Scaffold this active site. Structure first.
Site, PDB file in Angstrom:
ATOM      1  CD  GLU A 102      -2.872   1.075   2.256  1.00  0.00           C
ATOM      2  OE1 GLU A 102      -3.773   2.057   2.037  1.00  0.00           O
ATOM      3  OE2 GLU A 102      -3.049   0.347   3.255  1.00  0.00           O
ATOM      4  CD1 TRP A 144      -6.547   0.241   0.564  1.00  0.00           C
ATOM      5  CD2 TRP A 144      -8.562   1.145   1.131  1.00  0.00           C
ATOM      6  NE1 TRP A 144      -6.440   1.145   1.374  1.00  0.00           N
ATOM      7  CE2 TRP A 144      -7.310   1.678   1.901  1.00  0.00           C
ATOM      8  CE3 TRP A 144      -9.641   1.646   1.206  1.00  0.00           C
ATOM      9  CZ2 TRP A 144      -7.753   2.834   2.728  1.00  0.00           C
ATOM     10  CZ3 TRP A 144      -9.735   2.753   2.135  1.00  0.00           C
ATOM     11  CH2 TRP A 144      -8.891   3.029   2.935  1.00  0.00           C
ATOM     12  CE1 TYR A 170      -5.546   7.470   3.568  1.00  0.00           C
ATOM     13  CE2 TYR A 170      -6.309   5.641   2.148  1.00  0.00           C
ATOM     14  CZ  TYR A 170      -6.484   6.379   3.309  1.00  0.00           C
ATOM     15  OH  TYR A 170      -6.915   5.937   4.426  1.00  0.00           O
ATOM     16  CB  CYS A 188      -7.849   6.662   8.094  1.00  0.00           C
ATOM     17  SG  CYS A 188      -9.505   6.019   8.297  1.00  0.00           S
ATOM     18  NE  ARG A 237     -12.285   9.647   9.112  1.00  0.00           N
ATOM     19  CZ  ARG A 237     -12.421   8.880   8.222  1.00  0.00           C
ATOM     20  NH1 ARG A 237     -11.726   8.451   7.170  1.00  0.00           N
ATOM     21  NH2 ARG A 237     -13.316   7.975   8.444  1.00  0.00           N
ATOM     22  CG  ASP A 289     -10.778  -0.060  12.866  1.00  0.00           C
ATOM     23  OD1 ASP A 289     -11.551  -0.484  13.588  1.00  0.00           O
ATOM     24  OD2 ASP A 289     -10.250  -1.091  12.013  1.00  0.00           O
TER      25      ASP A 289
END
Ligand SMILES: NC(=O)C1=CN([C@@H]2O[C@H](COP(=O)(O)OP(=O)(O)OC[C@H]3O[C@@H](n4cnc5c(N)ncnc54)[C@H](OP(=O)(O)O)[C@@H]3O)[C@@H](O)[C@H]2O)C=CC1
Ligand SMILES: NC(=O)C1=CN([C@@H]2O[C@H](COP(=O)(O)OP(=O)(O)OC[C@H]3O[C@@H](n4cnc5c(N)ncnc54)[C@H](OP(=O)(O)O)[C@@H]3O)[C@@H](O)[C@H]2O)C=CC1
Ligand SMILES: C#CCN(Cc1ccc2[nH]c(N)nc(=O)c2c1)c1ccc(C(=O)N[C@@H](CCC(=O)O)C(=O)O)cc1
Ligand SMILES: C#CCN(Cc1ccc2[nH]c(N)nc(=O)c2c1)c1ccc(C(=O)N[C@@H](CCC(=O)O)C(=O)O)cc1
Ligand SMILES: Nc1nc(=O)c2nc(CNc3ccc(C(=O)N[C@@H](CCC(=O)O)C(=O)O)cc3)cnc2[nH]1
Ligand SMILES: Nc1nc(=O)c2nc(CNc3ccc(C(=O)N[C@@H](CCC(=O)O)C(=O)O)cc3)cnc2[nH]1
Ligand SMILES: O=c1ccn([C@H]2C[C@H](O)[C@@H](COP(=O)(O)O)O2)c(=O)[nH]1
Ligand SMILES: O=c1ccn([C@H]2C[C@H](O)[C@@H](COP(=O)(O)O)O2)c(=O)[nH]1
Lengths: 498, 498
Positions: free
Chosen positions: A269, A291, A317, A377, A398, A401
């Site tokens: 990623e 994703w 991103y 995120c 932000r 998880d």
């Protein structure tokens, strides 16, 4: 009556091959070994076996400033005559007999057992504590350590060290254990107070020096001092809003041992982030399907982009990273030229003006959100170089998880930091973690509950291979890496919330 | 046989008027005045003067679960209640004669003296500790306190509370005073700590719970653990990179006391971020000159903007908040309608979708930096509401000047939060501080440290005036506020590195 046992060890319990130690002189251990067995604050006994005695260098081998005893039958007195204070070295028929030699009680205050078989002997009561260097990089051995469990996938853990490294070896240190003025002002501390919580991580391990605990205790606090909130998905959250975790990189790399992290994809990623890909289809078939579920025909429809070829994360991103402010066309468009290449500057800056305070990377362009699969995120970071030409990172997120992504998201940027460290000609110091609404999902409870019953294992080293063909951040290629001495627990299945 | 006093006074030492108490019922004090005086984890004594007794409503008069002694010659015989019935009442002649009631010494652990006339004779020889509710507002009084040095500009501290409040009254609680195996674990801790003049904020204050300490301690660590660096200006700092602080709001606003905050400009500036003006000649003209420093003819010519009207900050903070990504023309230009009104989305979201994780405000628009007087320090913020309809804020600062700006910065985004909390119809809980390179200029080395000697004083509470007429964020006007019970030490004055 009571005694202690210094052992370094490969995770599968190896100790010494062809009569020696199989690891290249790891030196932060030799400190440790010394300054344990030598101290009563400011002499001790060190009782080894005959073959343990042999593996030593001649100049070294009267182990200094502590008495030595050797459990041997052949040799006894050919030992010395081989030349202040330093005690006549003794030989004791057996280990229970070494103990008998107590003519000696009061004249020594701690006895330390530095041999295999001799180790089996110790277990067959004696000890209480077992000083153990957890070595994670495996090597071949012949002499192995005896039968408490973990180290691989009773003497209870009471200390975990923070993972160090010398000459390619990651390892931490552990400890196993057999199983008025001031008060006059408490009247007020008494009432402003509420105390124990008690769904906490790993209680019996008192000293908690393995950096991972930030995370594990980040879990506890969440369920302990968090609130049960609604969010977008329909799956219940328990949130705190705003936390922090900083990690050491200058020794070992912070891949969560608590459960097998998905390395593979966090690497894949980052590249995808380094590349600028917006087609999640380029990921999916390389095996990374994280994703896949955020761009499905069914999902982009419920993100009001009926105009998107399943996969397209839009200007998400890394697009915002390399091409900021551009009019994004499609996941097939060659965007090389459009928009600010934030990322281009950071490295240009770092290699000329490291004292600058403008080394950032913003993925939050407000004039976008309703164009992406989802708004970012992890949205921003910053880079910094101090005295020792050491790079350091902060990333701001932000939405964090914790059950699932955080673990992931953690390496991601730590990994990145290594990336940047190298290209700019530096040695990587610390990554740090600043988080928004910090939460866990409800079906993550029972599963996380159980992850809390796992001891952190020494962190891995992650190496950049091909450092000499790598000159810029693109010259990085999914191969140029070595994930070494990584010893994970078992993966925990935790459902993602769509 | 030394003792403790139960005070509750204003900064000038005022305590009571026309026989009552001069402040509206303060409940968080009353509990505090309960719990203190009857305790020592498994009665105490309360001694007072004649009029001090006639203060109490007769339902309160018997001070339950403790011993009441009243030194007075006038009042001899009473009964207002006269059952268990453990209490027992007693009258006296003088205080040293109340002491002379030791019968009793076994039956009671400690005695507390709760006023004036009896306060001044308790010093004038026994005592030791002083339980004092620092009350931050003054009121009309007649009965004062005796001879203070830390209610306004021996008995040394030890404990500072965290500023609470009831019925518009802020107040701190303070204390003054007269002037089995882990032995195994030690060997290893020993060496790890091995690097181990450290200056420190008020070390003679043991319990440090005020809150400002974070900042004062923030200073300590900076010089204690930070690096000597060259920075842009050519001044030189000592920096740490990566600090934090989070402040209690739902009781008292965190306006800094150790040195007088330059409040005035903070208020004006935020509004000027709320308005989004770029012309600093507006600001200048209300007597705020913090910004007129980086927009001179010579500074913008040192920012290679030969085409900028002395003042024009460019498309800075505010502009980025209210009109994002839009072509900025001049400091007079009406831009009303262009770009994204980040802020407007925040309230919009908050009054409707509070459980959202998309309530932010980014001023890092990298497609701008080359245009502005300076690239944004306080660059990003985030809004969050738990299930208690309470607001919370994180702001993110890239760079921080601790000496001067930080205090300033602190209020701004706190002040903001109050606004946001009120407009969205909420009751604010907490602001939080996330800082990048955090540094103190080397010519602030001495000024600070002299600040380190100063006690925090109870925080002020800030009010929104005209709550009714205020319906949106704009409805705010530079006068819709009051700062209540703010009692700073003098401002130090620390030069700004141009
Ligand atoms: N990584 C680490 O922490 C450690 C590394 N190592 C390595 O381990 C290897 C050697 O270990 P190991 O093979 O087990 O040799 P040992 O050090 O345990 O010594 C074995 C010999 O000592 C005597 N002995 C040992 N145990 C007993 C017993 N229970 N009763 C009677 N005599 C006993 C015997 O001597 P005799 O034959 O004369 O009668 C025996 O042959 C080396 O490669 C060494 O470097 C060594 C120590 C710790
Ligand atoms: N905010 C707080 O923490 C406190 C609030 N207050 C307030 O203070 C006010 C009253 O205090 P104050 O006016 O000073 O009255 P006092 O409570 O000190 O009582 C005064 C009387 O007590 C006796 N007395 C007191 N001291 C002596 C002494 N050294 N020697 C001999 N006799 C003594 C005398 O009684 P006699 O004439 O009968 O002989 C004297 O006239 C009230 O307004 C009350 O509400 C009171 C307590 C603390
Ligand atoms: C962070 C981040 C990037 N992301 C992107 C991403 C996208 C949407 C999200 N949505 C939610 N609700 N939580 C997330 O963590 C999340 C993460 C990730 C997505 C999935 C996995 C994941 O499923 N990990 C599993 C299985 C992966 C595998 O083996 O294939 C695991 O091993 O635990 C990791 C990272
Ligand atoms: C943060 C911020 C906003 N700003 C903007 C601003 C701009 C450039 C900067 N540059 C540097 N190097 N440090 C700063 O703190 C700084 C702050 C401020 C600027 C000045 C003062 C200031 O001078 N305060 C003094 C004196 C003011 C007065 O005359 O009353 C004080 O009382 O302490 C405060 C805030
Ligand atoms: N944790 C651990 N690490 C070890 O290397 C180790 N080694 C042995 C046996 N092997 C050896 C080999 C050499 C030396 C040695 O030369 N010791 C020096 C260290 C030098 C220093 O101070 O750095 C000593 O004097 O203690 C010690 C043990 C037994 N228990 C261990 N336990
Ligand atoms: N810090 C402090 N605060 C005070 O209000 C105070 N008041 C006095 C004297 N005034 C008064 C008046 C009424 C009551 C009273 O009603 N006391 C109750 C408190 C009720 C509760 O528990 O909340 C008691 O039983 O103690 C106490 C003191 C003396 N020292 C003080 N000290
Ligand atoms: O890098 C990432 C990307 C996503 N998420 C998770 C956090 C949120 O729980 C979830 C949903 O996104 P929002 O609903 O907050 O947009 O994605 C992360 O933790 N890290
Ligand atoms: O709100 C602000 C504005 C400015 N500064 C200070 C921080 C830096 O010390 C200084 C210089 O800015 P840069 O050189 O980092 O751009 O301004 C703050 O701390 N807060």
């Amino acid at each position: 009556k009571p005694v202690c046992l210094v052992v370094a060890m490969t995770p599968k319990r190896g100790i010494g091959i062809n009569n020696g130690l199989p690891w290249p002189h790891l030196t932060t251990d030799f400190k440790h070994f010394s300054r344990v067995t030598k101290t009563t604050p400011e002499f001790n006994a060190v009782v080894m076996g005959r073959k343990t005695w042999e593996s030593m260098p001649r100049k070294f081998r009267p182990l200094v400033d502590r008495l030595n005893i050797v459990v041997s039958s052949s040799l006894k007195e050919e030992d010395i005559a081989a030349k202040e204070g330093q005690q006549r070295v003794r030989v004791c028929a057996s280990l229970p007999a070494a103990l008998s030699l107590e003519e000696y009680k009061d004249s020594v205050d701690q006895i330390f057992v530095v041999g295999a078989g001799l180790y089996e002997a110790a277990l067959s009561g004696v000890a209480s504590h077992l000083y153990i260097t957890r070595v994670a990089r495996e090597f071949p051995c012949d002499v192995f350590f005896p039968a408490p469990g973990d180290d691989i996938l009773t003497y209870r853990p009471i200390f975990i060290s923070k993972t160090f490294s010398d000459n390619g070896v990651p390892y931490d240190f552990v400890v196993l254990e057999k199983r008025s003025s001031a008060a006059a002002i408490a009247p007020v501390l008494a009432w402003m107070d509420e105390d124990r919580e008690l769904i906490r991580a790993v209680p019996h391990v008192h000293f908690r020096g393995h950096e991972e605990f930030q995370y594990l205790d980040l879990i506890a606090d969440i369920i302990n001092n968090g609130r049960t909130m609604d969010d977008r998905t329909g799956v219940g959250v328990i949130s705190k809003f705003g936390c922090t975790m900083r990690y050491s990189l200058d020794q070992a790399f912070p891949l969560l041992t608590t459960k097998r992290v998905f390395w593979k994809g966090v690497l894949e990623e980052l590249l995808w982030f380094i590349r600028g890909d917006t087609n999640a289809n380029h990921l999916s078939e390389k095996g990374v399907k994280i994703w896949d579920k955020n761009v499905t025909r069914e999902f982009l429809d419920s993100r009001n982009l009926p105009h998107r070829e399943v996969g397209d994360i839009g200007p998400g991103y890394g697009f915002q990273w390399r091409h900021f402010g551009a009019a994004y066309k499609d996941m097939h468009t060659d965007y090389t030229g459009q928009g600010v290449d934030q990322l281009k500057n950071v490295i240009q800056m770092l290699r000329t003006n490291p004292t600058d305070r403008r080394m950032l990377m913003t993925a939050w362009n407000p004039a976008a959100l309703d164009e992406m699969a989802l708004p970012p995120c992890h949205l921003l970071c910053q880079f910094y170089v101090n005295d020792q030409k050491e790079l350091s990172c902060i990333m701001y997120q932000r939405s964090c998880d914790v059950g699932l992504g955080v673990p992931f998201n953690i390496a991601s940027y730590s990994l990145l930091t290594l990336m940047v460290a190298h290209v700019c000609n530096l040695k990587p110091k610390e990554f740090i973690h600043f988080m928004g609404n910090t939460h866990v999902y409800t079906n993550h409870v029972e599963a996380l509950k159980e992850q809390l019953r796992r001891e952190p294992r020494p962190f891995p080293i992650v190496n950049i291979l091909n450092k000499e063909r790598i000159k810029e951040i693109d010259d990085f290629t999914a191969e140029d890496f070595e994930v070494v001495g990584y010893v994970p627990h078992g993966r925990i299945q935790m459902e993602m919330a769509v």
